[PDB]
Design a protein around this ligand. Structure first.
Ligand SMILES: CC(=O)N[C@@H]1[C@@H](O)[C@H](O)[C@@H](CO)O[C@H]1O
Lengths: 171, 171, 171, 171
C-alpha cells in the first residue's frame, strides 16, 4: 500500500523497467512541477503504454547513457501514471538549474496539434494531489511548462494551452 | 469550487451513462464496503471498459428496471474506476438489509477461476483510500465479500481469496 | 410452548440508545460468558443508570467509532439489566478470539475497591438463567472474567473475587 | 557503520524473557504509536524493572496463552526501555484494527494519579526518535493514548494528560 490516498501509480517492475542506477536524492518538500511531452509515439491501452515506457527508458539508458529514464513520472493516454525515477530521485528533464528543485512529469506522445484525453489530464492532477498528501510536494506548489524553463516546443502547443488553465500554474 | 485529494474516476458523462432516476440517499459516513463481480465480460482498455460499463447499466435499467446501475462503483481490468451511483446514492447490490448501509464496488468480469490484474486491485484499494479522505467512508470501514452477505458465488473464488488478505476485511 | 422468565431487561429504546450498526450474528447456543466492568462510574437508579448506559454507549460509538456499545448486556447498581447488543449479535468486548464464541456482560462501575450490591449480582445471575431458558446459552456454559481472557483489571478485584465462587465459573 | 544514533534498550536475554513464538510481522515504516500503561505496580531500579517485565510477560504467555508479551516495548521508571516484541513483530495491545498498523509502548505501572518520573518520559521520547532514525517509524508518526482506540482507562489520567502535549499526538 502507499501512505495516503495516492492514485494508482504503475510500479517499475510492472512495466518491466531496467534497474535504476541513479543516486542523487531530491530534497523532500519540492516546490515545482515541470510538465513536458515525450514527442514520441502516443499510447492508449495499458499494454501499449507499458511498452512505450520501456521504449523511452531504453532510449535514455542504452543510448544517451543516463542512469534511468529521465522523468520522475510518465503519463499515458490509457490514463495511468508510470513510475519513472519517482518522488525521491532527482530527474534529468529540465536542465541543471531545474532538475534538483522540481518534479518532471511527461505525457507520452506529441501534443503539438493533438490534445490528451481527459483521463490522462485527470491522472496527472491526481498524481499531483498524491504528491502533496505524501510530503514530496509542497502544498503551495507551482506548475511550469517545459518551454517556460528551457528553449523547446515541449509539452506541445495544444498540451501547453491546458496547463495554463491549471489552478497551480505560475508565470 | 474545491477539491479532491482522493483519486481519479471515469465520470458518468465520459462512459456515456443514461441519467439516474435514483433519489434515495446513503447516510454520510459509511461503515461497510461489499465487493462483488459482475459475472459478465472482462475488460482491459479504456475503450472496451467504458462499453461494458454501459452494457451492465443497460441491463440494470432496461431489464430489471432499476433507477440506475446497481453498484456505487465499477472496476475494470484496464486499471480504471468507473462512476456508478457514487458515494451519496444508495445502490442495489446486496439485499434490502445491506444496501442502506454500504458501498458496493464491483469488478467487471467473472473471477470464479480467473484473477484480476494488479492494476485493477490497486484501483479498488486506491478508490477506498480516497473514500475516507472525502469522509464518505469511516476510517475504520469494513470490507465484505458479496458471498459473506448473501448466498452467491460473487465475487468469484479467485478474487474472494484475495480480498480476505486485505487489511480491512472482516469476517 | 409458552414463555420463560426472562424479561426484567430494560430495552434499548427505553434507555435512549442510539441505533446500532452491527450485523455479525452469534451462533447460538453460546458456550461462554465473559464478565467485565466499565471501570467508570456507578448508578443506583433507573434514572441515572439509563444515563450511565447512554454515556458508555456514547464512548464506544462516538469516540471509538464502533457500530454499537461493545457489550451484549450492562448490569446496573439499580438491580436492572440493560440491553446492549443482546443475545444474537456479536459484541466487541473481549477480543477476536472470544467475541465470536461468547456473550459479554458488564457491570456499570469500577469494582476494584467496591463490591456491587446483591441486587446487581442477582440481576446478572437471573440474566444467565434466562439465557439458558431461551436456548441462547448452553445449559453448561462457562463464565470467565475479563482478566482471564485479556490483560485488564476488569472485572475489578472484588467482583473478580466474587465471580470465581460461581457454579459455572471455569479456569 | 556504527549502529545507529539509536537508543539504550535492555534486550530480552538481559531481562530473561521466554523465547517468543510470535511469527506475524509489521510493515515498516510504522505510522502509529499507542501509549498504554500496565496498570500494575511500578519499578524503579534495573533490578526490579527487569523482574516486572517478566511478571507482565508470564501473565500474557502462561495465563492468557499468548505467543509472547503483548507490547512491542516496555518503559520502566528506572529510566530504561525493555525490549518487548520490538519493531518488526506485530504486538497484541490495542485490538485487531491497530495491532497491525501500530507499535505499542507500555509504561510499567499505574498512572491514574501518578506521573511518571522525567527519566521515563525522556526514555519513551528517545525510543521514538530511535524508531524514526531506523526507518521503523514514519517521520510523521502519530501518537495515540490506549483509551483513544479502545475502552480502557489506560494509560491513566495523569499520563494521558502528558502525552496529549506531545508533538506527535493526534486526536
Ligand atoms: C470479534 C471482534 O473483534 N469483533 C468486533 C470488534 O473488534 C469491533 O471493533 C466492533 C465494533 O464495530 O464489533 C465487534 O463485533
Amino acid at each position: 500500500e502507499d501512505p495516503p490516498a495516492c492514485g494508482s501509480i504503475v510500479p517499475r517492475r510492472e512495466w518491466r523497467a531496467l534497474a535504476s542506477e541513479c543516486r542523487e536524492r531530491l530534497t523532500r518538500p519540492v516546490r515545482y512541477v515541470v510538465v513536458s511531452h515525450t514527442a514520441g509515439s502516443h499510447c492508449d491501452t495499458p499494454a501499449s503504454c507499458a511498452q512505450q515506457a520501456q521504449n523511452v527508458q531504453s532510449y535514455h539508458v542504452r543510448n544517451l547513457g543516463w542512469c534511468d529514464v529521465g522523468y520522475n513520472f510518465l503519463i499515458g493516454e490509457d490514463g495511468l501514471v508510470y513510475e519513472g525515477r519517482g518522488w525521491n530521485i532527482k530527474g534529468a528533464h529540465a536542465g541543471p538549474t531545474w532538475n534538483p528543485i522540481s518534479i518532471g512529469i511527461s505525457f507520452m506522445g506529441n501534443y503539438m496539434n493533438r490534445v490528451p484525453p481527459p483521463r490522462a489530464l485527470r491522472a496527472a492532477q491526481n498524481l499531483l494531489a498524491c504528491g502533496v498528501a505524501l510530503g514530496a510536494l509542497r502544498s503551495n506548489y507551482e506548475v511550469k511548462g517545459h518551454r517556460d524553463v528551457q528553449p523547446t516546443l515541449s509539452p506541445g502547443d495544444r498540451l501547453y494551452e491546458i496547463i495554463q488553465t491549471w489552478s497551480h500554474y505560475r508565470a
